[PDB]
Write a protein that binds this ligand. Structure first.
Ligand SMILES: O=C(NO)[C@H](O)[C@H](O)CO
Ligand SMILES: O=C(NO)[C@H](O)[C@H](O)CO
Ligand SMILES: [Mg+2]
Ligand SMILES: [Mg+2]
Lengths: 421, 421
């Protein structure tokens, strides 16, 4: 098996029509995917994407094509033999690095390409990605990871120790995952553009469906936020766990004041109270709003930023995203850093296929990394699943473990045509 | 004056022929510019660029084209009446933000576009950019800056105090600048790929020319670094200040050992000992290599990262880049933060026309912000200046202050054709 070529698709979805996805920073996102297919001589092709919200998708497409120079011609076996090495290779063109390094368009693109390789690998061995990785030995998992710029906080040796400690009880955890699935929260009732009436109805739906955790957007208007959360609490009941998300809009002092004003709602955490680059700022906010926790990560650019968020105690909840960074391999590195510091990972999802991606990632985290899932929640959003050949399945507040070979991200063929920008 | 259109040029220079620019991370860079021209109804056009090293320049081109949607159709007076507002506007399309925010391709592109506007403004009023800004009252300069995500360490009120304090001495400093220029160091002798013979010759030339500070590449091979720095000290003499640059290649523990091993050479500082995102890492390296100083910043993505580097005391020398970030306005913000913490700013230069840019920026810093230049050094490199209509002029180890209208970045027409990729 050789990667013999690649195709790209600038796919954009009219989510702004009903303001699905709307928040304090992004009032009218058009959920989009910079989509890549890695060609082989064989029966399988590697599908992958990275998520954007409309304009700018074509920049990610440009970056994917640039990265293709590094991937077309590779033997899949050379990749599998040491994927950490492949990861260094694909993020290691010094000239392409200049455009980053490991941030912005070039890293979004790497997420798509790297995950497409995983899709191909999984399809070839006949396993869903979560099982492909979960079945690996500690050394095999360790080999997937490029540790460059991590070693002062988590060196390979300490990562290997964590992996070995998790190894006993994988089989039992795999069985448990099959029986129970992995718990998730819903953001579906929370988009900032929704009318109060729509908020009420969707809160009731979320409660009826069996979700125990629900997330709501805040951050544009304090009066609106107080009203909305009061209404949300009314419909949801006192037992429901509520979280809130400001989407980066606040200054540090502003964040502290505003969150504390929403304390009556008993939010578990505030997500992204400020810029996703501001480690020290998140830490300041964290101290100022305790016992309300702080979550961030959906735009955290790479493992180097995550390691500083985690090591400095700037956050309570680590929200990795499946394709913001360099795909699965870098996510795994961050999950290991989080495990060292005993911080829970609650992945960002929704978007286009992000649920499809992160379901696998958390399941690896549960089976082979930290061994705990019950107190955690993967994000879930009920948008755009009809475009996927193997959509995530969620019922009673939990993702069912994927069965199909691959990374669950492959779209129906018609979608690749109808939504081409 | 109205911005009526824009043209882009993917310009790439074969600098890898002689390994000019070569370092431990980037063995064969091809100095490139994603170049932009803003068209108007009148007689001036706004020229700007952002700098890359070859492959990936086309991603910046795509990002510039994307930003064009925010700039084409704008009236220049609207921009001029509140530059901070324009800056927020150009970096604040929430969809284009997703591709960053304020990092990677989209922000490199912002640097080009923002600086091109400055070029147009400066041409319209008939002044070099440095003097255009220097002639401004403190309130007018404050107005240039978008302070979002800065207010926890520098809020507009305190930035104005800094600016007002520098106010009375401006006239004297301008006279002094006209008289003395602004001191600069040279990297012309330091590229890692040069032979020892060429190293000797360039060291002798740098010494004869009157530079008091000279920078050398290190970090690929310890034995090479020891020999080369021994040669450099021999050729440059004891009075010369030698600095070294590792271009991000090391882990924290590795950086400390390697730098300390070069202590015999008396390096003033180590530049980019590790990843440009690792604030806490630079701080640890800084503690480990004392008294050798730490410099970083040429790839520092934005004001938010710089703010943290500075406030946490993670570096000794702040190396802003003219077009890595959102152009002049964001640089001025960082310079004000630096002034608060009394950290010197020594801008990164070389590349394609970076010298031509940063000369203006440091002179603004001298005249209107921190009021001190004698102890500092702007980077200078003698490459590619023949492509510019008004190239920088260096003699006796000092930049002559620009005197022609504009930002000194406009290239000769023949170059725009001859070097199109
Ligand atoms: O913040 C988010 N989820 O938590 C979304 O990515 C954002 O609101 C865009 O729809
Ligand atoms: O590091 C640098 N100057 O300090 C250069 O940008 C780099 O070496 C690329 O030529
Ligand atoms: Mg969010
Ligand atoms: Mg450098």
């Amino acid at each position: 098996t050789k990667i013999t070529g690649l195709r790209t698709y600038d796919l954009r979805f009219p989510t702004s029509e009903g303001l699905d996805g709307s928040d304090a920073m992004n009032p009218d996102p058009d959920y989009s995917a910079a989509y890549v297919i890695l060609e082989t001589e064989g029966t399988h092709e590697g599908h992958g994407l990275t998520f954007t919200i409309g304009r700018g998708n074509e920049i990610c497409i440009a970056a994917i094509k640039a990265l293709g120079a590094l991937v077309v011609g590779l033997d899949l076996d050379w990749i599998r033999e040491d994927m950490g090495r492949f990861w260094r290779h694909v993020t290691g063109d010094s000239q392409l690095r200049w455009i980053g390094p490991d941030k912005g368009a070039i890293h979004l693109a790497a997420g798509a390409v790297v995950n497409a390789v995983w899709d191909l690998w999984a399809k070839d061995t006949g396993k869903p990605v979560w099982r492909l990785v979960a079945d690996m030995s500690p050394a095999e998992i360790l080999r997937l990871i490029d540790f460059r710029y991590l070693t002062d906080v988590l060196a390979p040796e300490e990562a290997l120790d964590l992996l070995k400690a998790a190894e006993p009880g994988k089989e039992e955890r795999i069985a448990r995952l099959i029986e129970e699935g992995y718990p998730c929260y819903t953001t579906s009732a929370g988009w900032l553009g929704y009318s109060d009436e729509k908020l009420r109805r969707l809160c009731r739906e979320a409660r009826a469906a069996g979700f125990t955790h629900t997330k709501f957007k805040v951050g544009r208007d304090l009066s609106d936020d107080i009203r909305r959360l009061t209404i949300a609490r009314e419909e949801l009941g006192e037992d429901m766990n509520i979280m809130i998300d400001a989407n980066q809009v606040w200054e540090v002092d502003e964040a502290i004041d505003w969150v504390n004003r929403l304390a009556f709602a008993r939010p578990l955490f505030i997500e992204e109270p400020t810029s996703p680059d501001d480690v020290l700022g998140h830490k300041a906010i964290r101290e100022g709003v305790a016992p309300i926790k702080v979550a961030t990560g959906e735009m955290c650019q790479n493992r180097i930023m995550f390691k500083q968020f985690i090591a400095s105690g700037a956050l309570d909840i680590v929200q990795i995203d499946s394709c913001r960074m360099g795909g699965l391999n870098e996510v795994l590195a961050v999950m290991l850093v989080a495990a060292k510091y005993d911080l829970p990972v609650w992945p960002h999802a929704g978007g286009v296929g992000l649920c499809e991606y992160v379901q696998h990632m958390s399941m690896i985290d549960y089976v082979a990394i930290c061994g705990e899932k019950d107190s955690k929640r993967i994000e879930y959003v009920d948008h755009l699943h009809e475009h996927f050949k193997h959509p995530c399945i969620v019922t009673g507040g939990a993702y069912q473990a994927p069965h199909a070979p691959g990374f669950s991200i492959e779209m129906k063929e018609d979608t690749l045509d109808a939504f081409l920008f």
